[PDB]
Structure formats: C-alpha cells, structure tokens
Amino acid sequence: SCARGCGGDSDCPCPGWHCPSPGGRCEP
C-alpha cells in the first residue's frame, strides 16, 4: 500500500502504480 503523497513515480514503490500529479496521492 503506497497511495501516499507522491511527487512522481519515485514515490510509488508499488510496481504498476503511477503518480497522477506531484502533490497528490499515488494511484495503481
């Protein structure tokens, strides 16, 4: 589970996830 405040893919350690917008939460 890594739906956290992401600034990019580098904040998503979950394989297959994406960061929609720098500042938002990561999405699968």
Side-chain angles (χ1 to χ4, degrees):
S1 304
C2 59
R4 307 296 296 137
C6 59
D9 177 85
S10 184
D11 290 289
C12 302
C14 311
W17 286 58
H18 70 267
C19 187
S21 306
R25 295 175 64 189
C26 191
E27 308 177 312

